[model samples]
Target: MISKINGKLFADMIIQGAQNLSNNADLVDSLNVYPVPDGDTGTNMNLTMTSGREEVENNLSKNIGELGKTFSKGLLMGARGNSGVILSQLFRGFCKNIESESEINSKLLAESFQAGVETAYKAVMKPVEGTILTVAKDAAQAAIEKANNTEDCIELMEYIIVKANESLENTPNLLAVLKEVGVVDSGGKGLLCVYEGFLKALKGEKVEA
Candidate 1:
């Protein structure tokens, strides 16, 4: 199992996430919490992630931190909607913590996710629960716990994914709107898609279907 990752691997992980999100864009868009004529959470997030993927793919870097900064910039500039902006903020905070580091380990990765949740929460004019924020916070907590138990980044990420899924499933209970229709948080669902891609890249894999 890979215990740490450098810039190239990190870029791959982000790119894979973008591709996976793109593949599931329609599914994610269908889960939009609102009935707005143009509520396309999935499409928005996918485009934002694609922006990041292009940057990392074009401007290669051996320094993971630099790559993260580049990814964050692309996300922010191409952010499409509220979900997209929050996703960008999440990476912006995560990359901020990496600084000029050459590689990332379980511990660093855990804190970076935590930082992401913090930044995403602040980006919204008013934070709401039972959404992507909750998913990110729960996943980051799981990542920290796993990091404490193992140095393997893959293992840590696996646990985080499980937590994120669980948290996503609980969104309906937390939001009145979601409860009425019995649906999970759409934005959280979108974030989980990206997280799934992150796990796949760590294990040298891809999205199914």
Candidate 2:
């Protein structure tokens, strides 16, 4: 099992994540509710992440920090709606935390993901829980807990993905409107797809479509 990843490998991980997010756009959009009156969160995330992937691919690097900055910049360029900017902000903080690292391990991964959550919370005009924000936080926290037990990034991410899914499923209860609509957070669902791709990438498996 791969124990750590360099900047170039990290780029591929996000490439797969973006592709997964793109392919799962319909389901994610279908889950969308009051986040925006006309928000297609799945589509927004795809657009935002696709651009970030493009940037990462165009400027492939062995230095994780530089590559992440390129991706963060690309994400902003393609940001369209509330979800788009939020996704961008999430990664913006994530990349900042790893800006000096050439490679990443489980502990760094957990820390970076938590940093992303923190950044997203700060970036939003008004903070609200039980949304993608909650899912991100929950998953990051799970990763942090798991990292304490293992240096294996793969194991840590598996738990993180599971926790993300659990948090997404709980979103309906977290927000009254979601319960009324009988749907989970669209953004949260979308984010989970991205993490799934990350898991596959960590396992040295390719994610297609």
Candidate 3:
């Protein structure tokens, strides 16, 4: 069974995985519903994730707690548009729940995910039903439930991937903008990409490459 993960290790893993997602901004952008396209969800998520990465790299402490604090603060200040802000909320909450641990288990990982959902819900002044927030919330909730029963982070993460996909498919149903554009939630797709990136990291892939 997977045990607690070092805070530094966890932060590094997440940042690298997020960066990998950012690298494929074009693919992720293709999922954007609105053609009016400003920065789009993938770009915003990249900015937010990069900001967190900078914070973690700047921190000398190997402590997971310190890394969490740095990532949360950095994301909050660097958070740009809607997607950026939401991603920041996710990192902040994830750090909060993970703390500075030497190792992480499925249960703690699930808690961190739940924290992300709560943070995202609290950040938005007007919470939309068919957006990244809803997808993440649903996925995180599923992860937490799965973790409670099993210690396999891989399994929990896989479950999150499945849940996120389901949410993405249902997004067009929630928002007319998505329906009109012939796509699902772009932001939601980006978040799922990040989740997939994390899974890749677990498989020992150097995402930055």
What is candidate 2's lDDT per residue for 15-83, written digit by digit as tens? 889988999998888888875645588888898999999988889999888889999999989986788
Candidate 2 minimal-lDDT segment of 10 residues: 30-39
Question: Model 3, stretches more than 4 Å misplaced?
Answer: 34-36, 100-102
Compared with the true structure, all predictions reach lDDT values of 0.89, 0.88, 0.77
lDDT of 3 by residue, 1-209 (tens): 34455665566566666777778777766776553566366777777777777877777456767777887888888886788888888878887876656567788888888888898788788888888888988898888788888776667778889988998899889888888777888888888877888776555556755
TM-score of each: 0.96, 0.96, 0.89
Every model: Cα RMSD to truth: 1.4, 1.1, 2.2
Inter-residue clash pairs, candidate 3: 3-104, 4-103, 4-104, 5-103, 5-104, 6-102, 7-64, 65-100
- How far out, in Å, is residue 199 in model 1? 0.6
Per-residue error at 3 for model 1, in Å? 1.2
- Quick one: ranking by TM-score, best first? 2, 1, 3
Q: For model 1, how big is the CA root-mean-square deviation?
A: 1.4
Worst 10 residues of 3 by lDDT: 1-10
Q: Candidate 1: what lDDT?
A: 0.89
For candidate 1, write residues 1-209 as lDDT tens digits: 88888998899899888888899899988878753536599999999999988988899899999999899999999998888999999999999999789998999999999999889888888888888888999999998888987988888888899999999999988888888877788889999999989999999887664
